[PDB]
């Protein structure tokens, strides 16, 4: 239980429909190379687009991404405590959160409902997670590697994915095509046919 | 080979702010503001994690105060506007007289404020539509999703309308069952 989070602190000073907009952005990142093994934590900060000050778990202290973020860098690294927290990031923040979701995000798996249809064949894979998947066309036990193409991986924001893999070909009277799907939700190579 | 991002932002003058966890591009949960409660982008995560509530707000108010400062560091340099890039597509393949969902893709935009309309033929009707909050991209631009449960009539033509300050005038990206 108990999902945890991170936090930020002030800068130097204080503060106070066509109106000109302003935007602040804070991304606490994380990066996991194969599980709880080597882990890279990132604490970023932005202004509009531009990244100004940063913290790399591998640099052990706040650096600067522009002279525009120069001060905040020196300012935070001047605070003993905080640096001892962010230094522990990977273990308090990353490993932890990851530990909670090692179930319903990392290991979460769902079947790839697969269809097919001319519009040139089409092969529509749907509602599958993760999106790491192989789809290869087959003409009569041979693999057709050319003249193919992919819509690539698509994202629905609901955790399902989707992809359209087209195959441009001219058939004749009694051959058989095939569309083959392997996603690590499947013990077997799910397939579909056309004639 | 994996990412856990907790991205947050404060926006002035609109004074609106967001708090969310992007895991591998799809959202986990975002703490709502008015409601001031945990809201998952998917409920199946409902009883596992259980995130703090006002906890978000603490950050947010911070990010505000950071913005106040970081503004006077630039000599009050405003935001460079960005247009969205819109495409509308069907969840599964569209069949005849089969249930389905339109998904409106607004992408690569900023600041994170948009007005979306689901209308047919020009009929502004919304029956149990759905909208996900802003998802952060690599370029720190923004992503978003409006859904639209619906049925495939060879008659109707459904349309998506997105208003943003990046486009000098409202955008209409259409779709029709073919």
């Amino acid at each position, epitope marked *: 239980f108990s999902w*945890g989070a991170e936090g930020q*602190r002030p800068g130097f000073g204080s503060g106070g429909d066509t109106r000109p907009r302003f935007l602040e952005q804070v991304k606490h990142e994380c990066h996991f190379f194969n599980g709880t093994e080597r882990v890279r934590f990132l604490d970023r900060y932005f202004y509009h687009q531009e990244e100004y000050v940063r913290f790399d778990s591998d640099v052990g202290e706040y650096r600067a991404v522009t002279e525009l973020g120069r001060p905040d860098a020196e300012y935070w690294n001047s605070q003993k405590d905080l640096l001892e927290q962010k230094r522990a990031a990977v273990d*308090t923040y990353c490993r932890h959160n990851y530990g909670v979701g090692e179930s319903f995000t990392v290991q979460r798996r769902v079947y790839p409902e697969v269809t097919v249809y001319p519009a040139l064949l089409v092969c529509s894979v749907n509602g599958f997670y993760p999106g790491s998947i192989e789809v290869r066309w087959f003409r009569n036990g041979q693999e057709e590697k050319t003249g193919v193409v992919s819509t690539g991986l698509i994202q629905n924001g609901d955790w399902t994915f989707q992809t359209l893999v087209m195959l441009e070909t001219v058939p004749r009277s009694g051959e058989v095509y095939t569309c083959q799907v392997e996603h690590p939700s499947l013990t077997s190579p799910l397939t579909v046919e056309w004639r | 080979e994996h990412v856990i991002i907790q991205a947050e932002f404060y926006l002035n003058p609109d004074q609106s702010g967001e708090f969310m966890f992007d895991f591998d591009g799809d959202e986990i949960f975002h703490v709502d503001m008015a409601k001031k409660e945990t809201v998952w982008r998917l409920e199946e995560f409902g009883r596992f994690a259980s995130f703090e509530a006002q906890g978000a707000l603490a950050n947010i108010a911070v990010d505000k105060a950071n913005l106040e400062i970081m503004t006077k560091r630039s000599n009050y340099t405003p935001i460079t506007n960005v247009p969205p890039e819109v495409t509308v597509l069907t969840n599964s393949p569209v069949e005849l007289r089969e249930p389905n969902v339109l998904i409106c893709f607004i992408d690569k935009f900023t600041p994170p404020v948009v007005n979306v309309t689901w209308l047919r033929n020009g009929k502004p009707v919304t029956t149990g539509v759905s909208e996900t909050v802003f998802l952060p991209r690599e370029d720190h631009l923004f992503r978003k999703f409006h859904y639209l449960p619906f049925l495939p009539s060879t008659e109707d033509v459904y349309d998506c309308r997105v208003e943003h300050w990046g486009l000098d005038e409202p955008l209409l990206k259409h779709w029709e069952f073919d």
Partner: T-cell receptor
Amino acid sequence: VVSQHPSWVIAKSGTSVKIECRSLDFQATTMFWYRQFPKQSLMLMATSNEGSKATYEQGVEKDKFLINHASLTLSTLTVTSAHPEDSSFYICSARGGSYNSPLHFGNGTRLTVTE
Amino acid sequence: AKTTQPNSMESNEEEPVHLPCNHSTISGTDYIHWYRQLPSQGPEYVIHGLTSNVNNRMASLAIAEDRKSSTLILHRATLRDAAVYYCTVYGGATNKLIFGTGTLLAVQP
């Protein structure tokens, strides 16, 4: 460091009691208002995130206590409709940010309100 | 209800005093803070740590292997240590500092 003014005070059976809290140096993103009754414990009344709706922990008298938290510094906990049963030890704290930001306290304001 | 402590406890001057704290079970990322209060005045910081062990001036800190229990250590107890010692939890899952029931220590001259 943070100062609580006034440190002592007394008013009528009801009145406006305006208790400030000021962070003399750092910017205060968050404010915690604790009140402590005689030989009891430290109870958490409210939370003021800068320029926001102040969240009152459950079991409070609601609009009875009002937090004006203003910019980064001036923070006004004002209690109107004074009551004898409310005389207590009122302690305020400031924070240099969100989670795991050291919680910086203050003097605290001891108050008796008679009729 | 965050963490539990014994209401009151007695010691002797110059004597080492060990202060028990049991918290239930606490989440993965939360620090354990120990705050104390002079008889009438604001509270004040003492010491904290994730796991393992930690010590500084004014005191030391004993965290159990499973992080189920913690113990505040006072090497040589002076008269000014008489006070209430609160044991709380502050961290990633708790933004708010939730003040416990308390341990009152009276040290005898």
